[PDB]
């Protein structure tokens, strides 16, 4: 997945140099550009986890609150009976 | 909030410059670590939030269960009247 935070600075250190060569220039601000996209890709899929989990949480909260209607209603439904 | 794609994009761009204002290029070498570490905290925040709502799947699971367990012995008594 993305770049550590230790090997994110090491590029940014490299950058630093003027007297860099231009192909090495060039690669380096690559691998942020496709390290930059690799992280947003990464963010994305948390979320669409996140957005999947927080939908169960939500339909078993109702389904769980339909139980407990039932359950109330056949605690009452046993003084009668 | 991190960089958008397009505002990273632009400081990369800069960069590829080999005559930049050496000024300029460590306030943009600088922006980049900074985002960094702020995009490293975002994805951090909602880690936090998606395990605290894998903690409450779970917790809704036990509830489900404990008034389906209620549910039966209720039923069951329903029928020893």
Do not use: C, M, W
Not at 9 to 31: G, V, Y
Not at 41 to 64: I, P, W
């Amino acid at each position: 997945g993305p770049l550590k935070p230790e090997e994110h600075e090491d590029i940014l250190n490299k950058l630093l140099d003027p007297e860099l060569a231009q192909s090495e220039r060039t690669e380096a601000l690559q691998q942020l550009r496709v390290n930059y996209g690799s992280f947003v890709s990464e963010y994305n899929d948390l979320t669409k986890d996140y957005t999947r989990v927080n939908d169960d949480v939500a339909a078993q909260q109702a389904t769980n609150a339909k139980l407990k209607a039932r359950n109330d209603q056949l605690f009452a439904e046993i003084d009668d009976l």
